[PDB]
UniProtKB/Swiss-Prot annotation:
Tissue: Expressed in tissues and cells in which the myoglobin gene is transcriptionally active including cardiac and skeletal myocytes, brain and kidney. In the adult brain, expressed in the piriform cortex and the indusium griseum. In the hippocampus, expression is localized to the dentate gyrus and CA3 area. In the cerebellum, expression is confined to the Purkinje cell layer. Present in neuroretinal cells: expressed in rod bipolar cells, amacrine cells and ganglion cells (at protein level).
Location in the cell: Nucleus; Cytoplasm
Function: Transcriptional regulator involved in different processes such as glucose metabolism, aerobic glycolysis, muscle cell differentiation and autophagy. Recognizes and binds the forkhead DNA sequence motif (5'-GTAAACA-3') and can both act as a transcription activator or repressor, depending on the context. Together with FOXK2, acts as a key regulator of metabolic reprogramming towards aerobic glycolysis, a process in which glucose is converted to lactate in the presence of oxygen.
Gene: Foxk1
Gene null: resulting phenotype: Mutants exhibit a growth deficiency and a severe impairment in skeletal muscle regeneration following injury. They show atrophic skeletal muscles and their satellite cell function is impaired. Double knockouts of CDKN1A and FOXK1 don't show significant differences compared to wild-type.
Record PTM text: Phosphorylation by GSK3 (GSK3A or GSK3B) promotes interaction with YWHAE/14-3-3-epsilon and retention in the cytoplasm. In response to mTORC1 signaling, phosphorylation by GSK3 is prevented, leading to translocation to the nucleus.
The entry's DNA-binding region: 3-98
Protein name, entry field: Forkhead box protein K1
Superkingdom of origin organism: Eukaryota
Organism: Mus musculus
Outcome after substituting residue 45 to A: Decreases DNA-binding. No effect on transcriptional repression
Subunit structure: Interacts with SIN3A and SIN3B (via PAH2) to form a complex which represses transcription. Component of SIN3A-, but not SIN3B-, containing multiprotein complexes. Interacts with FOXO4 and MEF2C; both interactions inhibit FOXO4 and MEF2C transactivation activity. Interacts (when phosphorylated) with YWHAE/14-3-3-epsilon; promotes sequestration in the cytoplasm and leads to impaired ability to bind DNA. Interacts with FHL2. Interacts with SRF. Interacts with DVL2 and DVL3; the interaction induces DVL2 nuclear translocation. Interacts with BAP1 (when phosphorylated).
């Protein structure tokens, strides 16, 4: 299960939102936290599939379209366009309630 310090919906925002434009391949976020976050380096045999499935039911993330043309040069998913303003407010936030400042 590992230990996700960032929700699997906010944790991804810093991934794609901070990546190139705002999209990432299924293995983008993994190179994200596993890179900057040291905790997600030896214990990743849990949230790994949590992200792939998280970008499915997430409300801001969505897969990449491919009916005729493309938005750029990639093939995977990203975060919502008009939701990156509110989904980001939690992106730069620590996971806590009000018992440990």
């Amino acid at each position: 299960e590992s230990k996700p310090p960032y929700s699997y919906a906010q944790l991804i925002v810093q991934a794609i939102s901070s990546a190139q434009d705002r999209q990432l391949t299924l293995s983008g976020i993994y190179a994200h936290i596993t890179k900057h976050y040291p905790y997600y380096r030896t214990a990743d045999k849990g949230w790994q599939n949590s992200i792939r499935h998280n970008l499915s039911l997430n409300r801001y993330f969505i897969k990449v379209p491919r009916s005729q043309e493309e938005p750029g040069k990639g093939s995977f998913w990203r975060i919502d366009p008009a939701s990156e303003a509110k989904l980001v407010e939690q992106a730069f936030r620590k996971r806590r309630q009000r018992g440990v400042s």
